[PDB]
């Protein structure tokens, strides 16, 4: 918008280009993690945790 431009120009903050779509605990719930399991497709890298 014509104003976020001014703020960016003043502080020289840059853009992201990626969102923050991550899994987070639903509000009001407090437990401990007892298990994590990862299912990767047959053509994916299988990072260190997997």
What residues make contact with another protein under the rule CB under 8 A? 1-7, 9-11, 13, 42
CB of residue 13 vs another protein: minimum separation in angstroms?
A: 6
Per-position b or e across 24-44, b if 16+ CB within 10 A of its CB: eeeeeeeeeeeeeeeeeeeee
CB of residue 19 vs another protein: minimum separation in angstroms?
A: 13
Write the CB contacts of 15 (distance below 8 Å, at least 6 apart in sequence). none
| Residue 7 or 50 with smaller CB distance to another protein | 7
| Residue 22 or 32 with smaller CB distance to another protein | 22
């Amino acid at each position: 918008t014509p104003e976020e431009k001014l703020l960016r120009a003043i502080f020289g903050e840059k853009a992201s280009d990626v969102k923050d779509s991550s899994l987070r605990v639903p509000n009001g719930v407090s437990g401990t993690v007892i298990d994590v399991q990862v299912f990767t497709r047959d053509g994916v890298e299988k990072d260190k945790r997997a």
